[PDB]
Amino acid sequence: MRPALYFCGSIRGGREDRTLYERIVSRLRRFGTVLTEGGDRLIHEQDLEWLQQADVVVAEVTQPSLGVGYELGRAVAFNKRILCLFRPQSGRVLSAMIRGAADGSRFQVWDYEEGEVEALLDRYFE
């Protein structure tokens, strides 16, 4: 009944939002098990195992990242429930591939202000 959760955020794209990712994961742990807590081959394979196990995939999509985009594309194809979180105050324009993938139900993209992330997650998960 408590969901398994998969979190996505930029790493090699840049760690600008690392503190925010820690806040997101701390809040997700209140609701479920966060599965995400060659060398790169092991990372890919283990992440893909967890992605298929996840009940919800949550991605912070403000910092551009190949790996986050790839995770989202694989997740869509696995028909996962997906929540993407984007901060327009960053001054970026979110990728059309992510904004345009939203169908408002199984794949949602929410624009938000950084201070409100915990409350937003509360509204989505309760």
Add this chain to the structure above:
Amino acid sequence: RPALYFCGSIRGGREDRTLYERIVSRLRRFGTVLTEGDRLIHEQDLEWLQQADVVVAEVTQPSLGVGYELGRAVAFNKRILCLFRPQSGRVLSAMIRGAADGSRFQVWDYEEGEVEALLDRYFE
């Protein structure tokens, strides 16, 4: 003729725009280049991706849309060629480097001056 889908950063940044033009110009010699509001962009691109025979991505500039295209392409069972420049100083995403299997999903490091010769070798 073989149908080719090219991927490269746009909203991730257009730093490598000139290089993308060079790649696309060369790809036109080998096949149909399918990729010569946002919902329409996504839907049209996904239609073309589904119709592709080979997906070619320049993965040096980090980009959500390029990563998403590559994830969808894997699930659509497409042949994939990724091109990365170490001269950028970046460490390429583990999700892209680690998705490679050396045959149907290949990731090549390259130097900008050699991109035309690399593509000639890949497309014979």
